[PDB]
């Protein structure tokens, strides 16, 4: 199945007390493998997964230098943006950056991306063709004009399509147990009569990886259903993910429904049902 | 692998 490795960068200005806070994190699929937090003593790019530790010292010294560079660029920005948006030195603002690789089942290149945001909104992003820029507002225009002048896109392309993919499959090869595993949903159900008449079933699913997973209810004629309270997939914390989707039915007339779990980890898609 | 280029000031 497809894979990927992204890098998320967040920088928050703290007017009145020290340099902005810089927190960068690296993922491969749904697995974190590195991090950095200017508020840590370390002041080094740290590991967050077994395989990634195997990397040599030159690696970290290198990755650390880079990230700090990313951090420095963000700092400078934070200043610039206030400028572009006529905003006082008092307020706190936020700069975000995310870029990564997508590869196919054949570990080949699929798409690349590099997005930047300010105060929770899109500032400027590189299009799919790893060539064009999408300027959010009047401010971003200024940026995509200098970014075009300096042929930033070209540099990013070189990386996205080139380096990022190699190292991705490099990591996929070393984390061949983690990144390339595939846990399965330990599904289970729960009742919950809303007192007489109606009832609410809860179709659970815990301990699965990757997080991608669908669980839809159905019944007789056509499958589907609305009144289905589906909660966003959450991290179990141990590396797997939890999630469930509840729906509402009329006492008894209930044992005529069932949610269908779909997940690559499942050789055969499950269709759990109720049985009291 | 962090990007080694294509990163500049906005």
């Amino acid at each position, epitope marked *: 199945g497809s894979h990927s490795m992204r890098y998320f960068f967040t920088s928050v200005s703290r007017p009145g007390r020290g340099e902005p806070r810089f927190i960068a994190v690296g993922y491969v699929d749904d697995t974190q493998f590195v991090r950095f937090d200017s508020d840590a003593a370390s002041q080094r790019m740290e590991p967050r997964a077994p395989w990634i530790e195997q990397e040599g010292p030159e690696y970290w010294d290198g*990755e650390t230098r880079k990230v700090k560079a990313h951090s*420095q660029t963000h700092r*400078v920005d934070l200043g610039t943006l206030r400028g572009y948006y006529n905003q006082s030195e008092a307020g706190s603002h936020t700069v975000q950056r995310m870029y990564g690789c997508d590869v196919g089942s054949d570990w080949r290149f699929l798409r690349g991306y590099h997005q930047y945001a300010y105060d929770g909104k899109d500032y400027i992003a590189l299009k799919e063709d790893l060539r064009s820029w999408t300027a959010a507002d009047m401010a971003a225009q200024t940026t995509k004009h200098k970014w075009e002048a300096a042929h930033v896109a070209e540099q990013l392309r070189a990386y996205l399509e080139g380096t990022c993919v190699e*190292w991705l499959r490099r990591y996929l090869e070393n984390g061949k147990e983690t990144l390339q595993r595939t846990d399965a949903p330990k599904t289970h159900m729960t009742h919950h009569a809303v007192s007489d008449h109606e009832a609410t079933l809860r179709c659970w699913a815990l301990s699965f990886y990757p997080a991608e997973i669908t669980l839809t209810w159905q019944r007789d004629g056509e499958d589907q259903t609305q009144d289905t309270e589906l909660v966003e997939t959450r991290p179990a914390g141990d590396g797997t993910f939890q999630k469930w989707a509840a729906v509402v039915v009329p006492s008894g007339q209930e044992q005529r429904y069932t949610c269908h779990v779909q997940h690559e980890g499942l050789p055969k898609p499950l269709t759990l049902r109720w049985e009291p | *692998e962090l990007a080694g*280029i294509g*990163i500049l000031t906005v």
Partner: T-cell receptor
Amino acid sequence: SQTIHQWPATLVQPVGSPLSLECTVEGTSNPNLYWYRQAAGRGLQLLFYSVGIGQISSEVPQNLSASRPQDRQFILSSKKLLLSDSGFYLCAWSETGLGTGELFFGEGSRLTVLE
Amino acid sequence: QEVEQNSGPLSVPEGAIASLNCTYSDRGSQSFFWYRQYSGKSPELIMFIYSNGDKEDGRFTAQLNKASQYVSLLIRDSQPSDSATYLCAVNVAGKSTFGDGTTLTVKP
């Protein structure tokens, strides 16, 4: 050099002597400053690297020191030079960030440590 | 090792083409350069490359092959003033790593 300056240009100093090298950059801001060194034959060696103001980072167990007292004032110094310290010290800068790479060098500074 | 130039000095007759090679070991390298240094003066950039292929500028042509971790430089119609040391550089680990350079001598 129309953006980077380095002095002194030539230094013939005696062993155990103190060293101070200054580098000035004009025409950019919050740039990446580096102290390379050219001894033995050719080939630059990275002695120091600064991501930003007052941020130094030795790249090898060394005897020299470096500081960046200001966005554009980079300095290299030694408590007391050792013959080993001889070499052609080069200061360079790359644009704030981590782009195409490409650093701009200065006049350079030749240091001959005599015994 | 890491950046490996071939030293020199090479001899090329005025007019001929000058080939220069460089090999980088760290596959993390993401941009490559060629600096020219004249005995005395400091290193002066001639070209940089960050995508497989050939990049032309005047009598200069860089050639990058990430697959071979190979970066070259050709100096078409070489002149005696091209004589110098050409330093190959590799932008990696948030910095530039240099080779010990390769001396060039264009016999007139």
